[model samples]
Each structure stands twice: as structure tokens, then as C-alpha cells.
Target chain A: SFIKPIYQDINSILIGQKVKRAAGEPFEKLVYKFLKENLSDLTFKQYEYLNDLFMKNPAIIGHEARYKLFNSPTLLFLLSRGKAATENWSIENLFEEKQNDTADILLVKNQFYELLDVKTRQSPNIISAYKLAQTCAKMIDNKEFDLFDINYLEVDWELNGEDLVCVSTSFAELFKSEPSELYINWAAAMQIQFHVRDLDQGFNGTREEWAKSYLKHFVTQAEQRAISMIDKFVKPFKKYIL
Target chain B: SFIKPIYQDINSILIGQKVKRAAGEPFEKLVYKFLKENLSDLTFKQYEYLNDLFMKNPAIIGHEARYKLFNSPTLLFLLSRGKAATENWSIENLFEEKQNDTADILLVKNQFYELLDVKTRQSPNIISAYKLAQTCAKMIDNKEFDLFDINYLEVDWELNGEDLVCVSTSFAELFKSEPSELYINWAAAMQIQFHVRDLDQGFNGTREEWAKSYLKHFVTQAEQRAISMIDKFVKPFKKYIL
Candidate 1:
């Protein structure tokens, strides 16, 4: 995950401070109407969208221009109250739509589901370089990811000059902090930007030991930049291989 | 990989005929200046981009809204003339930048490079449902992928009133034809669409038997629409699981 190594120097500080409003979908529908009037659990779906039935290519990231994560009654009260809903685990498709995911809200019950990702310091602090390389390649394939839990609700915002409001809302749990100065800046187009209050708190470890110390610093800095771009483009097909 | 269940009925036939010029990146820089005046090889990289160093989110697809498959010299003369360059297989990182990839031009010599994608009839025919679920999960993990192929340059375009031009340019090789009526229109958001002349032509088998008959019709129509969205959202936590 990379980007914002000064996304073009923060777009030259928002075009030398001529910035305007963009409160990311009204602070995600004010935290989805503040968790449907403060979390109630029975059932509450919200991802509707009919907005003149698509085709708004405001260039491409449509699906109502991002930020969603709707139903999670605090991840269904930490999965029907813990130990991943009694062992044999579940969480499959809580109303599908997980393409290129850093899951913007998902929390099904027994059939299984979990993955939250709804940040907001007014959007694009970034994260989701293929959902952190699909959670560091499902924590280097030693799978059972601490009983399925990639979370983070976040929120917190300010900028009222042109308007962006919202103050707080926290959720956390994802790789529980403490191993970051996190990276993946591959010339900032891959994006992993941070300072969401630097992982927003404590970290006793285990999201598979913090994704194996962040996949050993993301596969030793992406295999030392793929061995210097494989010695500058596979050294003339390496003596015609063999 | 689902979309074009009539992308809003093909945007009501281009807003009842009022469409305008959008020849995607001037036909991807006119097929990267017609493959640098017709491919000769010996290093010719072109993915440069500085136009005010990024910050145009015309909503989001940017990185110059799609299409790019620059180097291939017919996949470097079918990898320096065949047999996957003497087996110990290579292709690693020919100048990296593969984020959310449907590779817009990639063809490094030995340091490993392949995966073409290009296509045109002036854009949006669609594909990348997470690069076809990372090539059907690396061909269901048996992996070796018949000498790393995944190709398709195509091109063919028209529409003169609004100007799109290009009329020919072929190439093929990806899941070589035959699996027509391709899908993935999960309510048009997941998007997979087709009919680039119904996959341009012929196919006998093996791209792992055409990705096991297109991942058995994309996992039986995405597991029968994820078991009807897990019986409408995990039936109230399935009696609070066990």
C-alpha cells in the first residue's frame, strides 16, 4: 500500500490553499446516521444507490464516489460476542461487492463476514494497496487471521472554512498499531499513507504477529525493489536463459 | 468480474445519442505511438507521467483514465523464442508499477514481464474484476500458468463524428477465445462485460482448460449470488451461532 509521499506535495497544499469543500460523502452519511441511531443489531441495510442508475464517470472511482462501510453493530458486537462465533468460523458474503477491497463496511453473521475500513480525516489518507496485499498475502498464508478481523472506523475531521465538520468516532483493531512508520511508497502511486494518529493506539501484537512484522517490511522492501528491476530489465534476457 | 448487465442499459444508448469525444487517452497515445514506430526492442519504456505531478480526481480512475500495454514485441518474441526460457522460470519486476493492474504495457525481458490487456473499441468494455480474481486465483494455485501469458492488445476503433479513429491492430493470446458470453455483472458494479467481437476468435483449450471453463461460470454465478446474500444478511446471526 503506497501513495502520498506528498501526493504531488499535497497538490501543492491544495493549490496554494484555494481548496474548497469535499467532506467525503457528508462524513459518510454522518457515520451512517451515527450507526443507525447508535447500534441496534437486529438488521439494518443501507447501501442503496439508484442515482440515475450509474454512468457518472467523474473519472472512475464511482459507487457514489467512495466511503461506505454501512452495517457493523460494532462488528456485530465483536462477532456475536467473540471467539469468532464459536470456532468453525463463518463470514462469507454480507451482501457481496468486495472487488478491490479494503472493505468499506461489511459484517455478516454466521454465513460469515468482517472487514471494515471506513477512515475519514476527510478521505484519502490512503490504505488498500490491494487491501495491503490482501492482508499481507493472508499473513503469508498461515491463514486463520486472528479469527478474521481487519477493522477501523476512524472518522475525526475539521476544516470548516469551506466546511468539513465531524469531530470524532473511533473503532480500531486492524493490526493494532505499533509497527508502523509503515511503508510501500513505490514512487507514491501504490499508497499507504498514515498518521491516522499513527495506528490510533495500543498494540499487544497478533494480527498474526502484526502480519509477520508487516510481512517482513513488505517482503524486504519488495525484494529490494525487485532486485533493482531485475538488474535493469532482466539483463538482456539473461544470456537467453536456461 | 461483473458489469455491463447493460451498464445502465448502455447509458440509455449514450444518453439517447448525445455522446461526445472520449477516445481514451487519445487511443492510448495512439497505441503508444504505434508501438514506437513498430516494435524493434532493445529497451523502449514509455510509462512516464508528470503532467503537474498528479491531482486530477475527476472522481478517481485517473493515472490517465485507463489503457496501457506498451512493451511486447510479441511478448519479447515469445520470450526470446519459447519453452519458457529454459524452465527455471523468471519474469520478476520489469520496472514495477503494477497496482490494481490490468497491465497497461509491461514487457521486461528476463526479470520477468507479461500480462497485456489493452483492448479498445473506444474503452469501457470492461474486465479487471480484481484482474479476473488474480487470474482465477493463479489458476487455482496449481500455478506455472502455461508460460505466463495473459495477453490481448486488440485496438480496432471507429466513431468519426466524435473522433476515435484507429481501425486495426490485433495480438490475442489471453484465454484464447471460445468462452463467450463472459459475465460478472453483479448489478453492474462488479463488471465484466464482453463482445470485443465475442473474444476476437477461436480457442481449443488450456489457459488451464480456459480457466477451468471460466472458473465454472465464475463460481456458479458467484455462488448463486452468494447464497442470496447469505439468506438476506446472515439470518439474524443464525441463532447466535454455536
Candidate 2:
């Protein structure tokens, strides 16, 4: 009868504490370990289903996003629009749409740039010069189709808009151009930030706005880190931009 | 994985311990209290089929006796014999036969007593007595049949014999007979006991032997309690020459 409190406590730990730090390289390793431990007993189908959701901000985003948009006509409308855009593409078709038979790789590259632009927009306090690069992690992680359904593109889109802008703008101003070499680094960092933000909201979000704010902060921090990395890696490219 | 032990503990407390205790009377009271509290929000049927069971002992006796005997060849055979003997007799017929129609009552009464004596001979230990009592209790508790099913004279003769002996001997002997009541008490008890006991076993040597032992013990106890009353009340009984 009073079991709901127990569930709430567990949800907090899983989504809040562990997930927030999970963005840091050290925490990234922990996320994988945690997933494997919790999911080891699951059957192939269950693991696939659950893991698909986990990869998309893994801590709080999927549940929080769904819950918020579930009753919101505006968010639902946005999700429907995305679904309609991708309705005709078979999963296989999407897989093969790339040059060099590397659609997956190129899509990640595209997502990296998009995330960089969003991060720059969110934070203009720092500046650098170099080609900024961002890449999508695994498709498994970005699998939300709508605000509710965890699709690879949606996660890539949301984090790109949310976390990448801060990093990209800060890095571009730092060197007067975005950095190219830190693409992979920034991509990994974005993924980590996504999980952390999700975890925090999962732990502390009493209201929808609280959860949104937590996620927003996570996106901002990731952007800052991405910008910092660009400044570190591409000082040599500064002359070409000037 | 390692969580199995925790799950097992929870499951044991919930399914094993709680569920097991819930079947007992104490738990039933608790459940009723809970329902009254929570369900005060709604209305319920005033009476239920289950409550009909707690109304009387005969219903309990029938359910218990029938359930235990259903699979037992010996008890089943005895029940079948009793059913056959009283196949045509209604409750009115039984009551009338006891008074205006004495001959048939005496015949059945004698037969009933003989059957009970034989049962004692077959299983004289406390275990058997307890087992039979338990079965009878279960039957009465369940109220698995119509009121007619457990009517004193309507039950299968073998089943009725045990009740008669339990009621008239154990219960009646506890209340000493006064001298003025001697003839009526003797006639009523003997007629009832005999009709109930003789359905299967007649007064063969084994039947008489057991009956004599039981009666001697019963009479000795009765005499100790009311010596003069016992002498005046039982000395001239027709069934015993002594």
C-alpha cells in the first residue's frame, strides 16, 4: 500500500545522482557498468526495449518528456510533425542513406555540427577560432521519434539544440572559429551531459518546469565544455580563419 | 542476480506469510476492518453466500464429513448405506416416526447405534476422533449444501450417528438425569442413538462389544456424579438386563 515511496526513492538515485556525473569520462564508464548490472537479467527483447529508452538521456528525459508532452497539446503537435517527416523512411532506408555506406557515421557528424550551433547560441560569453565539430554517439542512445518516443535523431536534435550551442559559441570566440579536432570529444561529452541532466530531474523534479530547468542547465554545461575543448585543440587553425 | 535474495524475502513475506495468515480468522477480521475503512466509500451486498455457512453446525458437519469421506471407501460405503435406508423419509416423516410411528424409529434407531459402535471398534484412538471432528467442522463451516443436507434426521445415517453420540452422550451425560425424567430420557436417547447408529452395522458381537464398553464408561461417570439418580434412572432400562 505504501510501496510508492520506495519506488520514488529508487527512481531518484537512478536518474539523479548517478546519471549527472555520468557525463564526465569517469562517470561514462559508470553508466555502462550500471546498465549492464541492472539489465543483465533481462531477456533479449526486454533489454532491447529498455536499452532503447535508456540510450536517450537514459536517466530522466524519456519519462519526463513523455509525461510533460502527454498532456500538452503543443508538444504533442510537434512530435506528430516529426513523426510525419520520417514516416516514409524505413529503418533500413535510413541506414543506407549515407555516402561511403557510412550514413550512420555521417549522421553523427551532422548531429555534432547541429549540437555545436545550439551550444554557441546558448552561451556567447566565451569565444575561440577554429572549425567546431560535434558527432552523434550511437543510434541506440538517440532513438526517440517524438518528444515521447526515444529516437536517435530526436536525441541528437534536442542535445544539439540544447547542449552544443554553448560549447560551439564559446569555442568559436575563443579561437575566432570552431575547432575541428574536438568533434568526437565534444560528442561524447554531450552524451554524458544528457544523462546527468536526466538524472538530476529524475531525482528532484517536483514540477515540469523544475525538470525542464535541470535539463536546460545540463545542456548549458555540456556546451561550455565543448567550447573549451575546441579552444584547446585548434589554436593552429586560427590564422586560416583570420 | 544478487537481488534474488531480496526479492525472495519480499515474496516470502507477501505471498507466503501474509497470504497464509490471511486465511485464518484473525486475518479475516483484519480484512473486514480494512474493507470497512476503505470501502466506506462504497456500498456492498448486505449478505453473502459465504456468511450462510457460519449459521449452524449441521452445515459444517455435512461439509466436513462429506469432504473427508468423498475419497475414503469405508466412509463412503457407510454414507451410501444410510442414504438408502432413509431414502423416502422427509423431516416430518422422521419426527412423526419418533412419536406416532414408533416401530420404524425403533428399527432405524437400533441400526444407527450398531453402526456407531462398529466405527468405534474400527478406530478407537483420539486421532480418529479428532479427524472425524475436523471433517465435520469443515463441512459445517463450508455450508456446501442446502439446509436439508444437514438436517439432523436427513443426513446420511452414518454421519448422523456420530453427531447423535456426540450430542446425546457427551452433552447429555454432562447433565445428570433426575429420577422423574428417567424413562423419558432413556427412551429418547436410546431411540435417537440407535436410529442414527444402526444404518450399516447391526448389533453383531463386535458392535455390541464396543457399545458395552462405551456405555459402561459413560454410566460409571454418570453414577459418580449422581449415584442415587443413576440407580433410579438407569437400573430398569430395557436395553440392559444388568
Candidate 3:
């Protein structure tokens, strides 16, 4: 069963103007505000050009069309988010070029480095399972404070009256979150999306436990994906499975 | 040297609205009109849905961006053009689904069939060299009245005062035309574009001769492309060439 993101209207704030507005700027602006207010000593680098294009010319295509084409708006919202910490919030170094889909926000604070990626309810996209697996392996090898700590911060939004308002926020440690849909959507650019909304945020467990869970799932899904591809392409020539 | 497409403004007509207008409809409408008027006994099938989208929202991206993404507008205009004939102008069967880049317009007249693709100066796109090679081989094999007769019709346009006006029209028999540039543009989705504007319009050689020329060039370019790729990738592993 898929996990629904928790939301409280009282906690949610008004973001988009209550009129026919452009695309992503408002929600992203709100996320920036939250990170700024919640976190201290922050330096950020943004893809100003890419963001401008998304805001001005929003992609208008069917949900199915996303598989055939690179959804710029989806990537745009996903790229335009930040992270927050309670007390030791200090961003010593932060800079990333425009359309850098991997780690949208790079944060270095108090001698600790973090790769923070943003996501939204607007369009849950491919979470790049291969990259995640690689990171997990690296994490296991590097014992001292984790050489790679990538996080996904997803914001859920709902239409409040005429304006789109923030409904809730969910954070996931890439190696830990158990995503509802982890298998490769072959049609969707052959990418594995760790569906942000469908991730179990309630799994309060040790990193090792969570990592094992995700790794097992990843292997299971990878096996299925491999079998499917072989059945589609290679089976015609010679019967096979891995 | 690149063969620039010849143009005469007098032969062209006013198309786009003089004011700040939308995208493709006007130019496409003109092409449709030309085909309908010039040709007789015509039955046409159009991708109304796709056309509407292109006309309303044109793609705004740098030239290089086309490589990374499928340019809908480029495909749109390319899909929205037709053909002409003199005496036996009869499309007994004429229809094609939307976004069919391979054969935009399908035409059949008086026991003859044709696959007609449209191109414009707005965006010169991939011509699918492999597909063309396949078609040529098929054409050679199917000697009975020719099974495949695919063609590309290119129209050149220039800004005329307040409105954009067509300058000239050029036609290319895919297997016959000696393209100025035929090599694989590796950066551009790893697809080969015949560069509609740069095709030689004055080649009066026989189909077989033209076919040979094109094939020779195709092989030469393809060999270079293979070598370049191998040099970039496999050389690190082991020295090699094809």
C-alpha cells in the first residue's frame, strides 16, 4: 500500500497568488523562505536561466507524455528546493549550475557536506536507482561521518481556495526511504523513481536497518526489470532470464 | 561549402499575422493550401491535436538544447507539410497519425504511393540516416513499380517587414539528394539530419547515380563517426578502429 503524505492546513502557508499564475516560482520561493528562516549561515547557487524559462513557459503536456519527453517543469520544481537543520544550520559553501538535476542544492556547513535535492507533488520523477545504489555502497565503505549523504526533501501542495498552498513536507535519506514504486518504469526513459509522495516517512529505525531494507527492495526490483527487458528484447532470439 | 537554399521573395506569400503571433499554424496552413491547390484528387489526413499545440506554444530553446530533448515544435512543423503533382494528382489513400517523424504525409495517387516528409528553415532536424539507408535498400529490392518512394519537401522563409514570408521551396528525393552535410551529429541525439536547407537542388543525375553518391558519403561519414566514438570511449580500454 502507498503511504499518503501528512498535511495540516494550519501549518501550510499561502504560496501562489490566488489568481491565474505562471508555473513553479511561487512554491519554490516558499521552500527557499522556509530553508532560509529555519536554517542559518546559508550560501546558495541557483540555475537562474533554467528557472526563468520554466516560470515563463510552463510545459503543457499529458502525464503520459512525460515518458516520451524530458519534463522540464518537473525537473524545475524538483531542482528548486532547500534543506533545514534545527540549531547548527550554517551553509559554508553552496553552488550548482542550472539544470544540474543530480544534487540541486549543495550544502557545506560546520565542516560537514551534504547533497540536498528538492522534490514536489507537482511531478514525482525518476530517483536514479543506480546512482542511489552507488551512493549506498560508498556510504558503507566510508565509516567516518559518511562521504556521501544525499537527501530528498519533498513538499506537498494543495489548492486552497484559488491559490496553491503548501500542504506538507517530507524528507528522505536516499538509502533509507522505502519507496512505494521502485522498479524501473521502462517507458519513462527507463528510470527508477523513488516516488516521493509514496515513501514511508514513519520508518523510525537505524540507518543499517533502513539501508538493508532499501537495498533488498532495489535488488528485487532490479531482478524484475532485468527479466522484463530480457523477455521483451532477447527472448525473441533466444529464451532467457537472469 | 554548404549549399544555401535559393529563395525569391516574389514567389513567396505573406503567412504569419503581422503582429506578435503564435507559432506554426500560418506557415503550415500555407503549405496545406499549396498542396490542395496545386494537386488534384486529394484526400488528406492531419494530426489536428498536435498541430494545435505547436501553433499555440512554440518551443523556446537554444539551438544546442535540441540534442538533449525531443523538440516538439521541430517535429510539429516537419509533420505538417504536403506534396504536389501535375497530371495524375490523385491521393487514392492519404493519411498518417500525429508526430510520425518518419513519414509526415502519406500520399497515394493513380496506382502510385509516396511517403512525403516536410521540413522548414525554422528548425532543420534529424533525417534518420539509418531509416533512409533501409528505405534505399528496400527500394532497390522492390523493383515492381517501387514499394517505397519517400521524399522531403523543404520550405525556406525570411522575416518580411512586420510579417514572416516564405522565400522558396526545395524538394529532395531522400535517396537521390546530395546533402552538403550527411555525417552523424553525435551531440544531436546521435541522429543524422540531412540539413534540408543545404541539399543540392540542381543534381540532374539518375536515381542510381545519386543513390551511389549518397551511399558513399553515408558510409564515409558513418566510418568517421564510428572512429570518433571508439577514440573517445574504447581507446582507454584498448587501442582499436573499425
Candidate 4:
């Protein structure tokens, strides 16, 4: 027998190029079209960085495409999709909200931490973020598995990454409570992402180089965007970078 | 805010039951009933020494009951359901009787071995036998992946039990080739039951004494059945203590 049927089923859309786009400019539109057709329900803003990066480099139409597509408005949307796909593809619809309340928001971070921490400690075979979120959501909704008030600092802050660190800290402050188990530390998440990027660069050969170059471009663009934002808001309030 | 729905889905059939009896007796009705109701096409014959020990013991029932009620059969059926439920759960329906050319079988086996060996060597994840079977079946159906030859012995033979040994030898003879891949190793498959049984006994604190008492009874019953078959066929066979 042949394994063609299995592969075809798994990789039907992924293997064939039914949709096409120019190398730049229209790249974001391609992503938006793909997501809308394949995933559905995501807004255009949810795909901002993804659109920009894809417009800049259309070569990233594969699984590694996410590395080039982070940090734009689309990152959160794609993050939701990645988490959904990895953990529970069946319930991607649950991630429809543009924003979450304090409690629900905290739970999302808590769920992310649980996933990242387990994956880090276990090294692999830790439940995917999607699966973790699904299970945690089920536990709370169905079984009434009670969780104590999670103090973020008391929880092990592993898997830290630069971007994650900033996001997490901002999240913690936005909630107006000390980081609890529900609020993952942003720095820690960034640290973890950095390590993962390094590992990817070290292995995966040609694919690693392509991914690294794309990520470099993304980081540079994000830094520029941050500087611009700082000039628009922070410079008006204070003169120092600090 | 609650996760109760998913929990219920996973734990709903906790108290299901099934009946068992000796093969070829009036109890075949019970087996038929189970097969009809459960839609399971597989049955396993467990051997025990005859002393009426198992009949007198109820604790042994718990072990057998647990296996029959919850483990392999149920898990496989559930997996089949999951496969049918998703587009991603890709595997060929290998239960269909298709005559594979000897060369084709060899090619499939070679590809399977290449994947298995690489995965075993490089990854810390221990692949389950079920997963191995599923992936091999998928690859064979696809025909793109090359596995090891079916004639090359790659599996450890000692791990499997007597029935499996018979089945393996019979299959090999029928195919006119030595078995190479782990998938074709019927003996190893049979031995898996014993391993499961051993673990159950270990966890339940039932040891050699329990085996001598309860297990011997089942074995004796099996011996009686074997002798009856020999006598009915008017064939003289080597005699041994039950």
C-alpha cells in the first residue's frame, strides 16, 4: 500500500499553491485571504505585522512563516490561531474575542504559563498550548477545578524572552494586581522565545537560515515601530529613554 | 467560566460493563453479545492454569474486567472515532484485505524502519505501539516513504508470547519471508498483553502466589480444551501436566 492518501489528507491545502501573491505589497492580503478562507472570523488588524512581513517577503508561505509575521496586530490573532491549532483545533472559535476581561485575561496567561512551563520542564510532550488551554478551560467550566489566587512572582518564571517579558509586564500592570499565576511574566516569555529561536537557528539547516533572516527583519521592524511609538507618546511626556 | 462540558465528555462512560466466559461454551453467547453491542472485531484468549482457582477468586476478575472494560479495545475504538472525526487524523483503512506484493511489503517495512530508527535515536519521545502501527499503515498506504524490507528481522522476538509466536511463524510461512519490521511481529504483540498483565499484578500487589492459584486454574481449563481438540481429531499429541 501507499501512504499517499494520509499525506494528501494532511497536506492537501498546504502542498498545493491554490492562492498566489506578489513578493511584496500584496503579501498581507494573501495572508488575510488565506486566514479568512481557511480559518475565518479574524479581522484585518489581527493580521497587520503578518501582512507587512509577507508583503516584504512572500517566500514565507510555509509553517515557518510565523517567524516572519510576529509583532504586528496580526501576531495576537496568529498567536491565538497557533495556540488553537497546536492545542485544540476543534475549538478555535473560542478565541474570537478581541480583548478579555481581567479574570479571563489572567486565565489566558495562566494557561499559557502552564503550557510553557510544562513544555520547558518536560522538554517535549508537554501538552500543546492549545490543548492546555482547552483542558484548563474545561477544568474551570465543567469540573469546577478550583484554582487559588495565583501570585505571578511565586510561580516559577521560566521560559523568559525579551518580547514576552515586556508583554507580560504590561499585562501585569494593566490588571492592577501583582502578577499572579494567571499573569505570566513577559520577560520570562521573551527569554523562552529567544532560546527557541536560537535552537531553531542552530539546527534545521537551510530552513533555519531562512527563518532567522525573516526573524531578524521582523525584530528590526518592531524596534523601529517601538521607537516611533516612543517618540510619539513617551517623548511628549519625558525626554529620557528611561 | 466553567469547563464542565469537556470533563463530562471524557468521563461519561466510566461505569460500563462486559461479561466473559470460556471459549466455545454456552458463554459464547455473552461474547457474541459483547461483540454485537460494542462493535469490536477483536477478541483475546487469555491462558491460565486449571485448578478452578480463577472461578473461586473475585479479585482476578477486577484485573480482567478492567482490561476488558477500559484498555486496548476501547482505546482503539475511540481512536478510530477520533480519526474519522478529524481531517488531520490521517491513516489508511488497512483492515481491508489487499494483496501486497512481497516487494511492496518489503519496501513499506524498510520505510517504516527508517522513520522508526531515526525517531528512536534522535527523539526522547517513546513511541507507543499503537502509534507505530498507525503511522506505518499511513506510510504504506501513501507509498512515498521507503521502509525496511519485510524479510529483515528488526524486532526483538523474546518479548512476544506463544500465540503471537505461532501467528508470526504462520504469517512468515504464508508470506514466504522472515519478518523484519516490528509491525509484523505477532509474538511481540501477544507479549504486550502479558506485560500489561504483569504491570496490573504488580500495581495490585498480586504476585506469584496469586498467579499459582488463580492463573493456574485458567491454564488448566485451556489445557482441557486443547486435549479435547486433539482427541476429537484422533491425533496423538505430546501430553503434559495441565
In terms of DockQ, which candidate is strongest? 3
Number of clashing pairs per prediction, in order: 32, 64, 1, 64
Q: lDDT score, residue B16, model 1?
A: 24
lDDT of 1: 0.42
Question: TM-score for every candidate vs. truth?
Answer: 0.22, 0.16, 0.49, 0.17
For model 1, how many clashes?
Answer: 32
- Model 4, A1-242: lDDT tens per residue? 01112223313333222222202122223333443454333223322322333456544444344443443222232243453232332222222323211121111222121111101111112112222232333333333222212111101112244211111110011112211112111112111121121122122224223223333333333334334434432343221111
* Candidate 2 TM-score on chain B: 0.17
DockQ of each: 0.01, 0.00, 0.03, 0.00
Of 1 and 2, the candidate ahead on DockQ is 1
Q: Which of candidates 2 and 3 reaches a greater TM-score?
A: 3
- Candidate 4 positional error at B100, Å: 32
Worst 10 residues of 4 chain B by lDDT: B114-123
Pitting candidate 1 against candidate 3, the one with the higher TM-score is: 3
C-alpha lDDT of residue A175 in model 3: 41
Best by TM-score: 3
lDDT of 4 at A60: 41
For all candidates in order, the CA lDDT equals 0.42, 0.24, 0.44, 0.24
Name the docking class for model 2. Answer: incorrect
C-alpha positional error of residue B81 in candidate 3 after TM-score superposition, expressed in Å: 20
* Candidates sorted on DockQ, descending: 3, 1, 4, 2
